[PDB]
Amino acid sequence: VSKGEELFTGVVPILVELDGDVNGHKFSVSGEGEGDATYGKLTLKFICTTGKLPVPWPTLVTTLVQCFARYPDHMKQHDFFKSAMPEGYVQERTIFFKDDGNYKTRAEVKFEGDTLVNRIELKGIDFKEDGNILGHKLEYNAIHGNVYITADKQKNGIKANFGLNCNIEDGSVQLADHYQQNTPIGDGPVLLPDNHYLSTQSKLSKDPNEKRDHMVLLEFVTAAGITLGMDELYK
Prior knowledge:
Belongs to the GFP family. Keywords: Chromophore, Luminescence, Photoprotein. Monomer. Helices cover 2% and strands 49% of the residues. By secondary structure, it is mainly β.
């Protein structure tokens, strides 16, 4: 029914625009890059264009396009994200930082011409000014984890949950627990999946020629967790 997956057979330019406010510290982030869902591969560069990010870059990675996941052939009928294209979807999260504040995010991800645009509003509340987040105590390290997706038939979309560890300068870890929901923007058909997960690896780096507050991201996202069918033939 949807043919949105056809939009992702090659390299697709990506634009990200975030407007944020954490504890009243307001900021903007813009990013550009491209994604190649054939390989689940994303390459992006972000700048905090208001000048100075008031939270650590690693806390914004997950908020700053799972439509670029590589869904293996045997599980293509479980890719909600591309099915919603080009009209797109709303992705909303609440992200809890253990013993600290939370982010609430709302984004729309959709095509604008041939560009895949993720536009986000982020509100963070109840942070400690001397905590690991407003205090910039997190290391600028790789992030990896599994995003566990389930259908949400009532909303014609999906939910997901996951937990990530952020390494603190002092050696400990800062947990960031994510709750997610996605719903289509359009009224057309979408694919509602069986339970599965996205295996995501994000590598964070710096452009050695870039003096502005920024992040270079190289990421791989691969779907998994649907069986191949040996148990679906009979006994």
